[PDB]
Each structure stands twice: as structure tokens, then as C-alpha cells.
């Protein structure tokens, strides 16, 4: 499978308000994908985690979701 950084443009990892790209980092649930799946570096991942959590408080990213399967 592809990684998220691999299929994406040049984006601001620090902009908490850009949902279209930030949504691509959550999973089927609201969970923040691991580095195995985001292709991010050690430092980039630390920044993403913090920006996603910021967007979650503005109401733009979901804290958790429901899985439609099983």
C-alpha cells in the first residue's frame, strides 16, 4: 500500500485548519495513523500529532469514529 506523504503535495504540517489534508492522516476511526502508514519522519510525526489535536478542538477533526464493517 501507499503512504500518505507519498501521495500528497507540498503541505503545511503546522496549519491546523487545513482539513482536506489533515483528514487524510486519520484512519477509518479518528485515530492518528502510525509512522508506518504516514511515511513521516520522527520530527514530522510529532508536529502532525499536535496539529491534529488542535484541529480536533476546533471541531474540524473527529476524536473517534464508528467502524462500518464486521
Amino acid at each position: 500500500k501507499a503512504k500518505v506523504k507519498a501521495t500528497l503535495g507540498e503541505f503545511d504540517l503546522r496549519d491546523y485548519r487545513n482539513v482536506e489534508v489533515l483528514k487524510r492522516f486519520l484512519s477509518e476511526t479518528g485515530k492518528i495513523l502510525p509512522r508506518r502508514r504516514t511515511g513521516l519522519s520522527a520530527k514530522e510525526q510529532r508536529i502532525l500529532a499536535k496539529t491534529i489535536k488542535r484541529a480536533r478542538i476546533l471541531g474540524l477533526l473527529p476524536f473517534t469514529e464508528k467502524l462500518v464493517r464486521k
Partner: protein
Amino acid sequence: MRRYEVNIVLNPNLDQSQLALEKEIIQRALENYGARVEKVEELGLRRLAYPIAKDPQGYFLWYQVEMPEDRVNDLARELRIRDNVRRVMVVKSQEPFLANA
């Protein structure tokens, strides 16, 4: 004085009488705390990822300001007073860290 970004979500049911007042109330409180404005982005109605105050949407305001640092928390306290104000998040402005550059 440092530079911050003010994010303000308000109730997305207001008419023009109410929206203009709540916004000019925001203008008034900024003047009172010494916050010079630099630019503003008004995004308006936005689908929320979870219900906030039983309402599935929010009305969004973003401000880039330069104000004294000691007065930021007193500015937040004053903004959150209004009923129609739902979220106040004041972030210290940062450099736009690029990725996949």
C-alpha cells in the same frame, strides 16, 4: 508584543443583527486589550466533525494579531463570556513548517 492567531467559532444560526453585534463586540474587546490586527479570514459555516453545543455546524473566525503577551489570557476570558461564543483558541503564531518539500 508577540503575534498570535485567534480562532473563534460561534453559533451558526444568527441573523445579521446578531452576527454584526457579536463581531463588533469582538472588535471592542480587542481594542481594550491592545491587540493590533494584521489580517482576518472569515470562513463562516463549516461542517463540524462532532456536535458542538448540540449544533452540527459552526461559524468560523480567524484573526492574526500582535498584542502584549501578559494580556492574552485576560483576552480569552473576556471572549468566552458571550453565550454565542463556543470555542476560543488563541495560538502563538508559528513559521509554516513545510513537508514533502
